[PDB]
Amino acid sequence: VGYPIINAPSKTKLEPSAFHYVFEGVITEVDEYMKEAVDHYAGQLMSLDINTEQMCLNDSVAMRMAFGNLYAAFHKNPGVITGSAVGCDPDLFWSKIPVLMEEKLFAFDYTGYDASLSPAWFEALKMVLEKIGFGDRVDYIDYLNSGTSIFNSMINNLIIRTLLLKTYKGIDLDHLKMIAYGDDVIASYPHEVDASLLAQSGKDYGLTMTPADKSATFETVTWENVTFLKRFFRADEKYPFLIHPVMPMKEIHESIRWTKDPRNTQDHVRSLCLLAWHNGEEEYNKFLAKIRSVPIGRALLLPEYSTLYRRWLDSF
Ligand SMILES: [Ca+2]
Numbered sequence: 583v584g585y586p587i588i589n590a591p592s593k594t595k596l597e598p599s600a601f602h603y604v605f606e607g608v609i610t611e612v613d614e615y616m617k618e619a620v621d622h623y624a625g626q627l628m629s630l631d632i633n634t635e636q637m638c639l640n641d642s643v644a645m646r647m648a649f650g651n652l653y654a655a656f657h658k659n660p661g662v663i664t665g666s667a668v669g670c671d672p673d674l675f676w677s678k679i680p681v682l683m684e685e686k687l688f689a690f691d692y693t694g695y696d697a698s699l700s701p702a703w704f705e706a707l708k709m710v711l712e713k714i715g716f717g718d719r720v721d722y723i724d725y726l727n728s729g730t731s732i733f734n735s736m737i738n739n740l741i742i743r744t745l746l747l748k749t750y751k752g753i754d755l756d757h758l759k760m761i762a763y764g765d766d767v768i769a770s771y772p773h774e775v776d777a778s779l780l781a782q783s784g785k786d787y788g789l790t791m792t793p794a795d796k797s798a799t800f801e802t803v804t805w806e807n808v809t810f811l812k813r814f815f816r817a818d819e820k821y822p823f824l825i826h827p828v829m830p831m832k833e834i835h836e837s838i839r840w841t842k843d844p845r846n847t848q849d850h851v852r853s854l855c856l857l858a859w860h861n862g863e864e865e866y867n868k869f870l871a872k873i874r875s876v877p878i879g880r881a882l883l884l885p886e887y888s889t890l891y892r893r894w895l896d897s898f
């Protein structure tokens with residue numbers, strides 16, 4: 583599985599596609615709170631019994647030698663134990679997320695995540711690695727102070743715990759159920775957590791937190807308005823217990839207007855149809871109708887809705 587929009591390359595490596603005009607495009611050291619956050623998180627990772635062993639086979643691939651098994655673990659176990667979605671199949675994993683979350687959801691975005699991360703956060707990251715067995719290859723982290731999504735997601739787990747602890751004294755982290763993919767995060771708790779208050783705490787650690795998904799105000803987050811990896815959560819009409827990961831056409835329309843080479847348009851458009859069909863038939867067909875309003879589009883293999891839908895059902 584590849585993430586077309588989320589892992590979209592930079593515009594530097596892109597050129598206009600044949601569909602360019604067919605669519606439009608308009609806090610210094612580790613403190614008492616982090617320490618406890620480490621404690622709680624490291625504990626959870628232990629329940630996984632990740633293999634402390636090195637790996638059995640672009641130079642910086644020595645780190646794939648050091649943390650190869652760690653990465654493999656998160657990849658094999660995306661969820662609330664890892665607190666990571668890195669490596670999930672949105673088509674299947676979306677039906678599980680709701681079942682793994684506590685009743686009250688809370689989310690928010692970061693501004694300049696990677697840039698705003700103080701050195702302390704990395705020290706904390708090391709401590710987590712010490713407690714789960716990789717403490718001898720801890721120096722490999724200074725190379726940031728393949729696995730960026732992993733480590734950044736782990737730092738996000740430390741942040742949320744820390745902020746919760748500093749905002750509400752004595753809170754029990756055992757009831758925190760979150761999932762991260764880099765700096766994007768979906769989270770929950772049995773009681774309403776106010777993200778606007780977490781943000782105030784984030785300031786103390788040099789973090790800039792803002793309402794999620796471009797919002798002027800921190801509003802209540804719900805399954806009807808929450809997004810994860812830019813996708814919404816929409817239950818199927820025939821099987822409500824099956825959740826469609828719904829990427830907005832708006833995001834798709836923009837992506838189809840570019841490409842790396844005209845020789846990948848076929849693959850790239852395939853990717854986009856795999857995301858696109860979840861919006862519903864009427865939507866998908868209009869989408870293909872447009873693609874086919876230009877010569878190259880009419881020469882592309884585009885999967886018809888029903889086959890995609892039926893295949894999806896059978897995938898469960
Ligand atoms: Ca065990």
Ligand SMILES: [Ca+2]
Binds near residue numbers: 692767794795
């Ligand atoms: Ca986000």
